[PDB]
Design a protein around this ligand. Sequence first.
Ligand SMILES: C=C(O[C@H]1C=CC=C(C(=O)O)[C@@H]1O)C(=O)O
Ligand SMILES: [Mg+2]
Length: 373
Amino acid sequence: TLAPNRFFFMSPYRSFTTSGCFARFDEPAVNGDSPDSPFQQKLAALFADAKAQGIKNPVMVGAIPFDPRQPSSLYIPESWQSFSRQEKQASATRSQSLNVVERQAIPEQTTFEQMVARAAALTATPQVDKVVLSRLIDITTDAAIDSGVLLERLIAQNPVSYNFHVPLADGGVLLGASPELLLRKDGERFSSIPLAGSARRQPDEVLDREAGNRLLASEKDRHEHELVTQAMKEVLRERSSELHVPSSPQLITTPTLWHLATPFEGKANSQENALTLACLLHPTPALSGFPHQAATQVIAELEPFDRELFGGIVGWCDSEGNGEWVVTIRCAKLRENQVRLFAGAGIVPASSPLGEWRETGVKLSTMLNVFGL
Ligand SMILES: C=C(O[C@H]1C=CC=C(C(=O)O)[C@@H]1O)C(=O)O
Ligand SMILES: [Mg+2]
């Protein structure tokens, strides 16, 4: 299985692992949409240094937190190794039986439901339209957790998603099956596929198609979604030479959920790379809200924890400007015998406190399934 000190990224674009560590890069990504930012300037310096020291085709990999004024968890590895996503899907079980010493919802149901009610109340006012609220599950086991076994189970349960495994500076691992592309850049073209709006999958094909059709006709979820795509369209319109965005979202699936999705396909100029555009977008109203600053204030006032890397982005950038960044969701941080799971939900005036408790619950089940819980 995969050692915990290696980066792993599985995607229809590039799928690869890494080995070694040439240089860690913890510069905050704030203002990274600007080529003149210290983030971009130091990124460029570090790539030039890697090549000067004989690293061919250097890549920058890792995770950027929800709040990009915080330090990043990025690094250049010594080497990288492509693999076939299709072959991995075909190949991908247990090694240990784990006991649960403690399991704690943070916050608990009544508290989260009151948070949702407060956020919904705020979204009824002119000052904010949408706020994404989140919660955690902390689990302590009695034995160190085999992150490599977990990764293989994660892939087998989520063969199609953007599956990642990120070594962290504190010895932990960030692992997840993200369904949400934030920014892919491949030559001059770029894409983004925001997700917002959720309905539970059903085991029967008839009920399942009905859930999807219900989601597409749901005013609440379509509103929750259009607040994301309108904000993104406005920003991207001024930094793209062409941009195609469909008028309506389409249905996509994970193993647990239907989501509404809108693809963005654009062309960018020579000033841009995968991280300038990813930092321009991140976080969208899928993960913070709209307007962004007002939403993050409400998040800070209501969540009894710091998100850190949760709700950030994870992926990679090379020295030519190509890269891929996905939203850090359906994910967990683990270290030794401790695990933290994360899930959020976009709150609007039509949100129900119980409904959003349940929505975040279904989201948490992706990683609960990986652990066998
Ligand atoms: C913050 C999360 O979901 C975001 C992205 C997909 C669906 C969402 C929703 O439908 O509410 C959220 O905007 C999460 O999965 O933890
Ligand atoms: Mg939602």
